[PDB]
Design a protein around this ligand. Structure first.
Ligand SMILES: CCCCCCCCCCCC(=O)SCCNC(=O)CCNC(=O)[C@H](O)C(C)(C)COP(=O)(O)O
Lengths: 107, 30, 85, 546, 50, 64, 56, 125, 82, 77, 45, 117, 71, 88
């Protein structure tokens, strides 16, 4: 058995024991049935990075939003965006930022 | 599934493949 | 079309713009279309219940329009001679 | 929330294909893919709700321009209208369940994470295509989903048939893409801009519609371009499901609906012919996957006819796409579950009984079959009946042929679908494999598909459903009776004596054989003639020996 | 009219007709009865009397 | 050869002669391909022919 | 050819005769429906004096 | 269930054909040509002559109704005129060549409307 | 392993493989088994689909039994025109 | 204009579309080069040739072999 | 599949019956007349 | 007609392969094995009507006619087990053949890893 | 095989087939592309309001329309 | 488990014997390991072909034609199975 084999990990428990796959190949993705030891901590860190990038793209998306026409009614985009124009209904009555009929014609 | 669960301990330690085929020697930096 | 002229339009261009009506629906039943759209696009799940009257009115107006179109076709055929008079 | 619908699957796929995946494993890759799909699905649901119900279109400046040389200006810009919102919602809802199923189906595959990453790339590039405001980004999405399909079909790089099928599909789609590029050239030269909102046409030079429709038919696997679709079953079940539900096949029809610059006669003729061919193809086979693919082709033809009918027909076609995707993916997933319970058997003649598979899979297949065949008061029922009624009132005498052809096609659809269910469960058992897999995730994916199917009925796709069009009572009941006739004939499972017609129908009309030697072997011979005869011959300059 | 010639196959794989290897009609249409009962209750509660 | 008794030996031989196609058939199919896949050329040329026929009739009638 | 044991009634001759009856009837309805529909729609309005009194 | 044993492709041992660049050898048996059906047997042993003979009638059988309906029946077949719209509204809708409203034979300028609806291919200068 | 075990040669069926949990036919044994979550979810989805179809149909039964032409002409004759 | 108008674009952003098409035509055809044919985004040469051919055929007392000229082909011209 | 001459006879009989049904449909009274007559039947309850 | 290799088979072997492939095709044209059983019995019986044939000319006539019948009836979509030749599961994922590995190639013979000229 | 294909030049001959193929395809499609180019050039000239232009060997005529003239 | 893709001798023998006894002409006591088909069991060529197909079904195998032609006795078939890594 060659010297460098001792640095190599064995076949994973996921891998079929009757399979040989020339374990020495460095694969861009991990190779065959790859399953590291501290994998859950890696997963949590990956999710943290996912969330950070999510926040960055969320901020950029809210920044670069262009609304060319008033919406037809209440939308959740109001709660995180103030650039959203005040809605105008189908009948043309301007509506408040809560999407309800204003006084004089309401109730 | 190892350990009979999806939340079981890992199974792999060591070097997964040799990038560029560069292999460590006696712990000396490459 | 002279024998069965179209009825006057009860929906103006401005009203259709405000309702954001697709331009190929700007027919002789535009107001019914507008009311149906405004009702259904606000009801959530139970749209078939709380907007039944609006749908029925729109379909009744469309029934009138379809009858008018059929009558126009019949009159045109009779004038040209395709149908015995 | 807007850019989340596109960038998030792309980032997830990049992570899944990055060297970071080495440090995660298949468990982590599945977790990441499912989370990304769910988040993008939530964003898409919010966008759909706001756009469809409150009519708020939003345009995005993303990366500035892409390239602006001369009067040609191309920009990384994204706009979300009702069409884009519908496409994004449908694609995300499909691909989320597709990823859920793939996380379990390929659990014993070695390189699962690469499969997940390529699926995520496919979904992200579909989102890119639908997010396009101008034609260049549409082209980018077209070729990106093409590349992803090439990689996914050739996932099992150890089978030559899959490689051949992938190359054939790539070349056919490249023919369509050259046609589409020529059409784009014409569109820009005669319109001066690329944004769809800046494209309003009343009468073009014809070549616009012709070339665009040909390019679309290439992706939609219509007549003269459908041969690749059957061979795509060489790939894994999730790839076929995702491709046939809401991506790739839908892109051509999506482009046509977005454009509405076609010619009604050619559209109707092509759609009717393709639908008839798909219908006769689906009832004449014994591979389970090929039948469902041909059903996909038939529904594509239905949508083609609808969009050819008119603007209202186009919106009805879009709704038909929206309803078709869900149960198409459901049929693919149920077929995959049944196949896995049958030890990889992909042939109908070795099935039977209620022991091989779970109850939920059987019920899901039943519901999907009912919806697809237009069973009264169902998801496909509404769209199919709307298209039929709008096609029973067309002003084109050409359409009269199309109406009859589509009636026959729907009857055959019910026929082979009932035959499928009958061979799956009703017949006696005739195989050797029983491993009923009852894993939670694929069952939940089926549940999500069925819930979306329920939503498509309890909530209409557009305002067209419920708009009553005035037909004689027999005419409306006609497709119902046709489905009943298909039910009866299939439950009889009877056949004819005219065996020459059988051998013709089973061969897929020999189209593969025709294209094997009319263009292809002559291309090879032209290549040999050019090289040997010209270069080494006529163009050769020999040596002056001395 | 003898038919038992050359490895009669019906009897060879007759075990395929195992009752648990068959198509179960008990669960052929699950949830349908509850749906029918709910529909009846909804009709009687909403449309019939009020 | 260790798998021949499981998946077949190399006894059977492919019946292909590796020969170029029939000259006339090759020519006919090449022309068929050219016609099917270069239709815009013919459409434009026929448009020009119809246009020049219109001009010729106009010229013939306008000088009398 | 025997029918499936769990569904033996499907092999009955009457069932297949009925299936053929319905199939053929639907198949020819496919063609006969449209002109009858057009005539019916036309005479829905033709015989009405509200539009055409001369036809009563 | 990956890892199934697979037969290999033994290396050739006789002079190659001149045009051997059409047999796809991926290293595993069985190989295939460059494309299916290109040479050798076809599933069902059918021939191109068979399919040409069949299509010679099948194509015309499919095409015949198209020509008959496009050459012997007009818009008068439909018992109704298309959807009606006010003049200021219809005037833009019918401008589209694909628009179906052109088939209203009751239109005041019906023949003129159909006259504009013809399709050209080469843009005229 | 396989949910169906095959005995062959009339072998005595294993005693451990007999009971209410095993049902044999033609010497071949299959197991009577039940899955809770699967059956419950199947019942839920089936009931949802059935109720959906039933209620959608009941809301639109008149527009099916009689024609739209018939129903709307009946409404016009009986319940006015405007 | 297009994104502000929405549905009403077919009677609201005609003039700006005409302006933009005119600008594109000026950018292209002016100093077009030695080999480039002239470009009409609004199909203006097409329909003007169509009208001239219609008039010529009317003078010619024969049936038109070409489509009747269109009032406008785009959302602009 | 299966070869049932009963299916053939059913197909032919269905063809004939549906042709007869079409003939029956061709001579029916006007839908307007039918509705008015039914409303006469509905006005006497 | 059969292929040239089958033409070389012994009369017993030729007829055996004929009957075997006929059963295979009957499965291939069958809706189910259950449909295939009576067809199998009839096919077995038909050969039983030819058991006592001696005149080799008529034997050859019957064999040739049956071979032509079978050749006319080659199924386009044969029923194959998934992991055999022509099956869908064949050649999916094989074991990696042994491949030698070269460690630290750049480290060897440095400054002299270019190209001769 | 690879030597033969890299040294295939020794296999050329003026047989019946080679000559037929060379004339009908190579030179024929050369002529087709040439005529197509001529047609495209003349049509582009006509679509820009230009008179006949002098191609190589076309008698003295107008070349290079002036930028200072409106055609 | 056992075997490098191969099953045991004993279950193979038992399955082969159980398949073998499915003939009216066959007396059970005369079936045994390595038994002549024609000379001992008195089964015709059609019977041998049927038995080959039946064993192919039982073990889920697609036997090549030449190997099937080599099959002429019980022991030959059993040893052939004992060479198959593809038999279930
Ligand atoms: C879809 C179906 C298509 C048509 C399929 C073909 C149907 C036609 C079949 C009818 C023609 C025949 O039977 S083919 C005629 C076969 N019979 C003979 O040739 C005479 C006997 N000669 C012998 O050598 C042996 O007895 C022999 C029995 C051959 C070997 O059995 P054993 O070695 O045990 O001894």
């Amino acid at each position: 058995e060659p010297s460098w084999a001792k640095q190599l990990a064995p076949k994973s428990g996921l891998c079929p024991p009757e399979f040989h796959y020339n374990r020495e190949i460095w694969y861009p993705h991990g190779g065959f049935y790859c399953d590291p030891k501290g994998w859950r901590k890696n997963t949590l860190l990956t999710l943290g990075g996912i969330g950070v990038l999510l926040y960055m793209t969320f901020s950029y998306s809210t920044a670069n939003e262009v609304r060319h026409m008033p919406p037809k009614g209440w939308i959740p985009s109001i709660m995180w965006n103030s650039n959203v124009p005040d809605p105008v209904d189908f009948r043309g009555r301007k509506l408040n930022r809560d999407g309800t009929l204003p006084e004089g014609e309401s109730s | 599934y190892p350990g009979g669960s999806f939340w079981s301990e890992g199974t792999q330690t060591g070097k997964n493949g040799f990038l560029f085929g560069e292999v460590p020697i006696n712990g000396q930096p490459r | 079309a002279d024998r069965f002229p179209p009825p006057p339009m009860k929906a103006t261009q401005e009203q259709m713009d405000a309702a954001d009506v697709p331009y190929h629906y700007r027919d002789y039943c535009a107001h019914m279309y507008i009311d149906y759209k405004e009702c259904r696009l606000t009801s959530g799940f139970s749209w078939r219940t709380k907007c039944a009257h609006e749908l029925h009115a729109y379909n009744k107006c469309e029934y009138k329009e379809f009858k008018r179109r059929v009558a126009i076709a019949i009159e045109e055929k009779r004038r040209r001679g395709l149908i015995a008079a | 929330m807007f850019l989340l619908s596109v960038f998030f699957p792309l980032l997830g796929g990049l992570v899944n294909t990055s060297p970071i995946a080495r440090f995660l494993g298949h468990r982590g890759s599945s977790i990441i893919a499912i989370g990304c799909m769910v988040v993008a699905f939530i964003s898409s649901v919010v966008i759909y709700y706001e756009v469809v119900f409150m009519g708020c279109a939003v345009s995005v400046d993303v990366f500035g321009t892409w390239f602006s040389v001369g009067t040609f200006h191309a920009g990384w810009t994204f706009n979300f209208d009702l069409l884009t919102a519908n496409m994004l919602f449908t694609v995300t809802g499909v691909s989320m369940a597709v990823h859920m199923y793939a996380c379990d189906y390929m659990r014993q595959d070695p390189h699962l994470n690469l499969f997940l990453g390529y699926l995520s790339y496919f979904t992200g590039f579909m989102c890119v295509l639908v997010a396009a405001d101008n034609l260049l980004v549409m082209l980018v999405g077209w070729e990106g989903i093409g590349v992803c399909s090439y990689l996914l079909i050739g996932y099992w790089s150890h089978r030559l048939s899959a490689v051949k099928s992938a190359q054939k599909a790539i070349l056919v789609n490249r023919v369509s893409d050259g046609l589409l590029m020529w059409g784009v050239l014409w569109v820009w030269y005669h319109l001066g801009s690329l944004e769809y909102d800046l494209l309003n046409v009343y009468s073009a030079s014809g070549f616009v519609g012709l070339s665009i429709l040909i390019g679309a038919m290439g992706k939609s696997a219509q007549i003269l371009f459908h041969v690749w679709l059957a061979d795509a079953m060489e790939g894994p079940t999730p790839v076929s499901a995702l491709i046939h539900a809401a991506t790739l096949v839908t892109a051509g029809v999506y482009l046509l609906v977005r454009l509405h610059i076609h010619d009604e006669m050619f559209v109707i003729i092509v759609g009717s012919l393709t639908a008839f061919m798909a219908g006769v193809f689906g009832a004449t086979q014994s591979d389970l996957k090929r039948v469902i693919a041909y059903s996909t082709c038939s529904q594509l033809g239905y949508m083609m006819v609808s969009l050819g009918l008119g603007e209202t027909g186009g919106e009805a076609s879009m709704g038909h796409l929206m309803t078709h995707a869900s149960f198409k993916a459901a049929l693919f997933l149920a077929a995959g579950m049944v196949i896995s319970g049958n030890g990889g058997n992909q042939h109908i003649a070795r099935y039977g009984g209620s022991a091989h598979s779970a109850m939920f899979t059987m019920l899901t297949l039943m519901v999907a079959s009912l919806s697809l065949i237009g069973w009264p008061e169902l998801s496909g029922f509404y769209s199919k009946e709307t298209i039929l009624n709008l096609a029973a009132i067309c002003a084109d005498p050409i359409a009269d042929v199309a109406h009859t052809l589509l009636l026959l096609t729907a009857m055959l659809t019910s026929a082979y679908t009932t035959k499928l269910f009958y061979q799956c469960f009703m017949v006696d058992f005739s195989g050797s494999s029983v491993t009923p897999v009852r894993n939670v995730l694929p069952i939940l994916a089926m549940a999500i598909l069925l819930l979306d199917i329920m939503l498509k009925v309890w909530v209409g796709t557009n305002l067209l459903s419920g708009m009553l069009f005035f037909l004689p009572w027999g005419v409306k009941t006609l497709p119902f009776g046709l489905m009943v006739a298909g039910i009866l004939t299939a439950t009889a499972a009877v056949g004819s004596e005219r065996f020459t017609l059988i051998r013709f129908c089973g061969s897929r009309w020999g189209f593969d054989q025709l294209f094997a030697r009319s263009p292809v072997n002559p291309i090879f011979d032209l290549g040999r003639i050019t090289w040997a005869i010209g270069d080494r011959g006529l163009l050769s300059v020999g040596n002056l020996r001395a | 009219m003898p038919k038992v010639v050359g490895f009669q196959w019906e009897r060879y794989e007759a075990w395929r007709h195992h009752p648990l290897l068959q198509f179960n009609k008990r669960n052929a249409f699950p949830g349908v009865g509850i749906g029918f009962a709910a529909f009846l209750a909804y009709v009687a509660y909403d449309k019939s009397q009020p | 050869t260790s798998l021949d008794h499981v998946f077949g030996d190399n006894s059977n031989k492919l019946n292909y002669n590796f020969e170029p196609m029939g000259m006339g058939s090759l020519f006919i199919r090449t022309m068929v391909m050219v016609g099917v896949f270069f239709f815009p050329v013919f459409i434009m040329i026929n448009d020009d022919y119809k246009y020049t026929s219109f001009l010729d009739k106009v010229a013939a009638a306008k000088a009398a | 050819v025997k029918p499936p044991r769990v569904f033996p009634i499907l092999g009955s001759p009457g069932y297949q005769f009925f299936a053929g009856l319905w199939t053929g009837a639907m198949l020819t309805f496919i063609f006969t429906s449209k002109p009858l529909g057009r005539k019916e729609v036309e005479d829905l309005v033709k015989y009405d004096p509200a539009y055409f009194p001369e036809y009563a | 269930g990956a890892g199934a044993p697979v037969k290999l492709a033994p290396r050739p041992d006789k002079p190659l054909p001149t045009w051997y660049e059409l047999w796809w050898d991926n290293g595993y048996y069985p190989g295939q040509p460059a494309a299916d059906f290109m040479f050798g047997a076809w599933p069902g042993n059918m021939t191109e002559t068979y399919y040409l003979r069949f299509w010679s009638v099948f194509g015309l059988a499919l095409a015949a109704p198209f020509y008959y309906v496009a050459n012997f029946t007009d818009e008068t077949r439909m018992p109704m005129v298309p959807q009606q719209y006010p003049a200021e509204v219809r005037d833009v809708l019918v401008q589209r060549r694909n628009s179906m409203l052109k088939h209203d034979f009751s239109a005041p300028d019906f023949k003129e409307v159909k006259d504009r609806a013809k399709i050209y291919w080469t843009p005229m200068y | 392993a396989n949910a169906y075990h095959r005995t062959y040669n009339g072998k005595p069926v294993p005693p451990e493989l007999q009971g209410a949990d095993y049902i044999t036919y033609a010497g071949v044994t299959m197991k009577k088994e039940f899955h809770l979550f699967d059956t419950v979810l199947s019942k839920l989805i089936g009931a949802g689909a059935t109720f959906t179809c039933l209620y959608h149909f009941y809301l639109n039964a008149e527009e099916h039994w009689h024609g739209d032409i018939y129903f709307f002409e009946k409404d016009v004759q009986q319940n006015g025109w405007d | 204009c297009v994104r502000a108008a929405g549905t009403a674009r077919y009677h609201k952003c005609t003039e700006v579309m005409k302006r933009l098409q005119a600008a594109v035509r000026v950018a292209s055809n002016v100093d077009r080069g030695p080999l480039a044919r002239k470009r009409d985004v609004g199909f203006i040469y097409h329909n003007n040739r169509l009208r001239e051919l219609q008039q010529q055929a009317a003078e010619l007392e024969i049936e038109n072999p070409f489509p009747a000229p269109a009032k406008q082909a785009t959302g602009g011209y | 599949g299966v070869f049932s001459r009963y299916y053939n006879t059913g197909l032919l009989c269905g063809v004939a019956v549906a042709s007869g049904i079409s003939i029956w449909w061709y001579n029916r009274e006007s839908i307007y007349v039918r509705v008015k007559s039914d409303l006469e039947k509905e006005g006497k309850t | 007609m059969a292929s040239e290799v089958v033409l070389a088979l012994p009369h017993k072997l030729r007829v055996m392969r004929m009957y075997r492939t006929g059963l295979k095709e009957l499965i291939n044209w069958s809706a189910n094995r259950h449909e295939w059983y009576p067809r199998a019995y009839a096919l077995r019986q038909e050969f039983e009507d030819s058991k006592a044939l001696t005149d080799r000319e008529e034997i050859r006539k019957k064999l040739e006619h049956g071979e032509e019948l079978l050749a006319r009836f080659r199924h386009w979509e044969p029923l194959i087990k998934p992991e055999f030749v022509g099956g869908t599961a064949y050649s999916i994922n094989p074991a990696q053949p042994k491949l030698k590995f070269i460690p630290n190639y750049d480290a060897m013979d440095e400054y002299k890893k270019g190209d001769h000229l | 095989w690879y030597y033969r294909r890299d040294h295939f030049e020794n296999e050329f001959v003026w047989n019946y087939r080679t000559t037929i193929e060379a004339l009908w395809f190579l030179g024929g499609f050369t002529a087709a592309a040439y005529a197509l180019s001529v047609f495209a050039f003349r049509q582009a000239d006509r679509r820009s309001g230009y008179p006949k232009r002098q191609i190589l060997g076309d008698e003295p005529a107008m070349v290079l329309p002036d930028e200072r003239q409106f055609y | 488990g056992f075997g490098g893709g191969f099953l045991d001798k004993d279950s193979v023998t038992e399955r082969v014997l159980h398949v073998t006894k499915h003939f009216e002409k066959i007396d059970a006591s005369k079936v045994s390991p390595a038994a002549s088909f024609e000379k001992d069991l008195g089964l015709d060529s059609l019977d041998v072909v049927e038995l080959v197909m039946a064993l192919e079904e039982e073990f889920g195998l697609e036997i090549p034609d030449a190997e099937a032609d080599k099959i002429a006795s019980v022991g030959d078939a059993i040893n052939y199975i004992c060479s198959n890594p593809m038999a279930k």
